[PDB]
Amino acid sequence: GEDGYIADGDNCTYICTFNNYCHALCTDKKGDSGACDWWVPYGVVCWCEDLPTPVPIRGSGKCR
């Protein structure tokens, strides 16, 4: 469906160092694939491709 940085129900991304971790995390959540992006406005977090609407991605605002 959509692409972006997988977040949790409280607007928080997931930290990473390796692409494998993000890949599994993303696939675990029905995505196509995933990779760790080292330079993002939130730090080094997971980015997913073709992630379903049931799963949230980061949006504008705070992580609480």
Curated annotation (Swiss-Prot):
Q: In which tissues is it expressed?
A: Expressed by the venom gland.
Name the keywords, alphabetized.
Disulfide bond, Ion channel impairing toxin, Neurotoxin, Secreted, Toxin, Voltage-gated sodium channel impairing toxin
Name which cysteines form disulfide bonds. C12-C63, C16-C36, C22-C46, C26-C48
Tell me a GO biological process for this protein. Answer: defense response
A Pfam family annotated for this UniProt entry: Toxin_3
* Gene Ontology CC annotations of this record: extracellular region
* InterPro entries according to UniProt: LCN-type_CS_alpha_beta_dom, Scorpion_toxin-like, Scorpion_toxin-like_sf, Scorpion_toxinL, Scorpion_toxinL/defensin
**Subcellular location(s) of the protein:** Secreted
Limits of the LCN-type CS-alpha/beta domain: 2-64
In the record, what terms sit under GO molecular function? sodium channel inhibitor activity; toxin activity
Report the protein's function: Inhibits sodium channels (Nav).
Q: What family name appears in the similarity comment?
A: Belongs to the long (4 C-C) scorpion toxin superfamily. Sodium channel inhibitor family. Alpha subfamily.
Provide the domain comment: Has the structural arrangement of an alpha-helix connected to antiparallel beta-sheets by disulfide bonds (CS-alpha/beta).
UniProt name for this protein: Neurotoxin BTN
Organism encoding this protein: Hottentotta tamulus (Eastern Indian scorpion)
- Source lineage: Eukaryota, Metazoa, Ecdysozoa, Arthropoda, Chelicerata
